[PDB]
Amino acid sequence: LALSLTADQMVSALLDAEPPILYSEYPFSEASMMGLLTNLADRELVHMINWAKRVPGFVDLTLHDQVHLLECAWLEILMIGLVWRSMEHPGKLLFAPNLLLDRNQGKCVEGMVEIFDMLLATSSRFRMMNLQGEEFVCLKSIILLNSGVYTFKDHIHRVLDKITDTLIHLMAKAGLTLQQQHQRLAQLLLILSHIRHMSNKGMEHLYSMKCKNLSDLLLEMLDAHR
């Protein structure tokens, strides 16, 4: 059913499926910083899962396959979302409308500053490229379907192709030339490698703060990466 959709139907479906921007609880410490983020991320997860079911092609997968993809992609998806809504706030990360942080607050947790700077770098990259919302929702869907696909596929790959068609469709609409179209496509997809990298370093520290003392849902998302 996803393959039969047009490019605009794909875009509208993805935009309509967008999760809400949540608020955090109302100077920081290491424990309080991690508390606000853990709470926020845990509530975001619930919405992400409902967003995922609305990604065209995702419902066609087995429960086990759906579970696999979410377990692999969830931090990437949280991160690209964070990076996206941080665009209009250069030098800052908009975790929530009432939780806007700079890299200086990032040091409150021993090792957040490394990933903080990477996240800021990504946001600045998106701002430099003038990333559009229609492009953003395509990239986020790509992350969901691609990140786990080699750790189990043809259905998934054809859906991925359809999103590529959609991305190109959006760029042609914006008035980009043929050369500018594939160049921008490549640029956007290469950033996904960085998002994977940030997620990998991110997972690495969550395992190191479970040890020693996260919700049971977060713990189960984590155990899948160890």
């Binding site: 899962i49 995922a52 079911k53 429960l63 759906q66 579970v67 979410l70 049971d216 189960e220």
Partner: peptide, 10 residues
Amino acid sequence: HKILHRLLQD
């Protein structure tokens, strides 16, 4: 046994 299972089915 898996919370993610429940949230997806619901």
